[PDB]
């Protein structure tokens, strides 16, 4: 009986919920009530990257934390150097409609994609001296929202077709496919372990998938609207989710519950991007009200505001060494902050 | 200078890259952008042939004016997430099939195809991103309506309708109805044209429309406003 199946699903949902209720005696806020706060924190516009003429949609930091990659609708994927604001590379894209960009950990490759439904893998280091399309990965029936490199051969792509995928670059096929997420997946984040990753979708929920086995282990709810950005705590067992409801939700992987929400009555717009610091104390979220906000992770207090972008902040990143925080907004300027 | 030879040469490479970026930006600015939305089978493919994956891109030049037409019919995703990427287009082409008011949607007979057409139009015309962006709204299947009206009166789709079964009165009714969905009249405009397979001046209508939009945009920029 289909009604019996629905009833069983409801019973399982109740079992999950009361399991969380039993597994949560307390909340985060009371636990960290004695620690000293971060206090006021300010980051200046140390560098301003120019040359983009359309809205910036994505950014990614290189592993070394010197190079960075920026994507915009002008059809240009620009690889820049941070301290010396030079364009080490500028790649004309076939599809100007780009929403995702990725820097390979080895720095040899860079990923791009968008409404084209195709993930383009670009080989930077070649004898010819020109960046070329190393591979064109196809198969998602919707736009590619985000994509991160597992390594130089394996890449994860989340799409608006309600699916994530794990592709082998050299063969050009998708080895694994993560399905079961009702909405359009808008962001994914690999763990430092690089085998488990959390992906949030438009159905107001996130799922933690495993790369090897290929099945979701923990499904997290709590948001009132779409999820636009997701990121992992530097350790690995916690993850933060930026949503369209002006709240950033931090969860633990082991507890399977919502550890905290971040909101203040002033902010009403959605959260375009989310990020973390090196120690995990600071959570940086870019909003549509044109200013990045820095929250304290252990105390839901907002640590500060990075203002200076005249339009919607569309992407955030933190250098691997943790020294710099890069914000790329729709105003066609990326700013580095310290 | 306090910069090495290689540092200076890298700066020179960056200068070349900025020069090329400015050139490409000028080339893009010379170009006129159209976003084409067809509510189901609304003559999108036919008109696309006449003027000549997720997105289908076309480029054509008419009398020294360049046009990039973007079709998103195959996206089949939440439009709220990718409709803002087209903010800044010169115009939105919107295809509505007049023959569809007798026909019904594939998802049961509960909704008329015209009904879905007007909800989609009310969504896109009044969208926050397309606040000041003009719409060239093409009424397609004019011959099919002309041959087919006498069979089924328009009152079935519009119960408030009370008029003759001739083409002109019905077409005027629909055009007025669609122009009535415009919540905000002052900022934007709606250009209506009826097209068939035989006509060859539909793209001319597109050109006059975008010429009006270009003149309006510069009037805003040049100070005349």
């Amino acid at each position, epitope marked *: 009986e289909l009604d019996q199946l629905r009833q069983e699903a409801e019973q399982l949902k109740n079992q999950i919920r009361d399991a969380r209720k039993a597994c949560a005696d307390a909340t985060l806020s009371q636990i960290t009530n004695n620690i000293d706060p971060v206090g006021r924190i300010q980051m200046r516009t140390r560098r301003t990257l120019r040359g983009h003429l359309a809205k910036i949609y994505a950014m990614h930091w290189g592993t070394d934390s*010197r190079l960075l990659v920026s994507a915009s609708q002008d059809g240009k994927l620009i690889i820049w*150097d941070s301290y010396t604001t*030079n364009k080490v590379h500028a790649i004309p894209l076939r599809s100007s409609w780009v929403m995702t960009c990725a820097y390979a950990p080895s720095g040899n490759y860079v990923a791009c994609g968008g409404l084209d439904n195709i993930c383009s893998i670009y080989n930077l280091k070649t004898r010819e001296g020109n960046v070329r399309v190393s591979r064109e990965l196809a198969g998602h029936t919707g736009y590619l929202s985000c994509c991160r490199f597992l390594d130089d051969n394996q890449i994860v792509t989340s799409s608006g077709d309600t699916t994530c995928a794990l592709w082998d670059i050299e063969t050009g096929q998708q080895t694994t496919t993560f399905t079961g997420h009702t909405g359009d997946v808008m962001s994914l984040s690999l763990a430092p372990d690089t085998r488990l990753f959390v992906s949030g979708a438009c159905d107001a929920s996130a799922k933690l998938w495993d790369v090897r086995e290929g099945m979701c282990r923990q499904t997290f709810t709590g948001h009132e609207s779409d999820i636009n950005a997701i990121c992992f705590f530097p350790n690995g067992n916690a993850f933060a989710t930026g949503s369209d409801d002006a709240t950033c939700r931090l969860f633990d992987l082991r507890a399977d519950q919502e550890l905290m929400t971040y909101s203040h009555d002033n902010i009403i717009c959605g959260i375009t991007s989310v990020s973390f610091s090196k120690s995990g104390r600071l959570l940086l979220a870019g909003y549509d009200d044109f200013n990045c906000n820095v929250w304290d992770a252990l105390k839901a207090d907002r640590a500060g505001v990075l203002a200076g972008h005249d339009n919607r902040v569309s992407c955030l990143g933190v250098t691997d060494d943790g020294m710099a925080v890069a914000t790329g907004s729709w105003d066609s300027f990326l700013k580095i902050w310290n | 200078c306090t910069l*090495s030879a*290689e540092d200076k*040469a890298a700066v020179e490479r960056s200068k070349m890259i900025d020069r090329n970026l400015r050139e490409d930006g000028e080339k893009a600015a010379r170009e006129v952008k159209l976003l084409l939305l067809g509510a189901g089978e609304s003559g999108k493919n036919t008109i696309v042939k006449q003027m000549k994956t997720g997105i289908v891109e076309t480029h054509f030049t008419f009398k020294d004016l360049h046009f990039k037409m973007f079709d998103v019919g195959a996206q089949r995703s939440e439009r709220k997430k990718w409709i803002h990427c087209f903010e800044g287009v010169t115009a939105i082409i919107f295809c509505v099939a007049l023959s569809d008011y007798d026909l019904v949607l594939a998802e049961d007979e509960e909704m008329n195809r015209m009904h879905e057409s007007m909800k989609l139009f009310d969504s896109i015309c009044n969208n926050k991103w397309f606040t000041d962006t003009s719409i060239i709204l093409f009424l397609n299947k004019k011959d099919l309506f002309e041959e087919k009206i006498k069979k089924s009166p328009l009152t079935i789709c519009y119960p408030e309708y009370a008029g003759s079964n001739t083409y002109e009165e019905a077409a005027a009714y629909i055009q007025c109805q669609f122009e009535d969905l415009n919540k905000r009249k002052d900022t934007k405009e709606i250009y209506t044209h009826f097209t068939c397979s035989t006509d060859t001046k539909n793209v001319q209508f597109v050109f006059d429309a975008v010429t009006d939009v270009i003149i309006k945009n510069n009037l805003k920029d040049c100070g005349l406003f």
Partner: single-chain antibody
Amino acid sequence: VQLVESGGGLVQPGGSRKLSCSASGFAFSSFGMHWVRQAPEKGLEWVAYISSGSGTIYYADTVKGRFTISRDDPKNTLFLQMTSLRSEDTAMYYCVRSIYYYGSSPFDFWGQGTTLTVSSSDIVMTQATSSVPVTPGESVSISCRSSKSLLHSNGNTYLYWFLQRPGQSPQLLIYRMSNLASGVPDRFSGSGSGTAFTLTISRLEAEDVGVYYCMQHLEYPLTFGAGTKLEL
């Protein structure tokens, strides 16, 4: 990737002539170019350099004004115009390519070579050894000493190591004292302290037999090492 350079031959003294260098297999527009000549019995010496887009056209001090160099980007060619040759100009001219950005490998590819015969405050480079016996499979350290500190405040020291097999073009080994050239075995490594820099060969092979040269890339007039030759 090829660098074919044509011309050469015997020229009467005081003559004027154009050396040619035709490039293929890479974006000639994006790569700056160099002409670097070698005397019949002496080491390499820099001659000319032209940047991408012809922004800079530099020549060595001893040869300024007399020499010119231009590029044809549509046809992917490099030309070196030559005036009033002397006996000092009898040499083997090599066509070299370079590119300049963070992480790039300048002087990575070298040309085959052209022969030219003529009838009758710069940084000092010292390769004090100039002759070392080598036994295959044993680590050799070849040290090149510069006059002034090759370190720069940016965090880079600019030394380049080149290997020349006999009857063959020079090949890049190490750039910036510590970055291994792509396509070169790991047996070679580099290490330096800002005034003297050593190339270390772990296990010698037949391919390792040749002459080694050290370049500095701080001041624009490029200076070359005398050449440490390997004798087995």
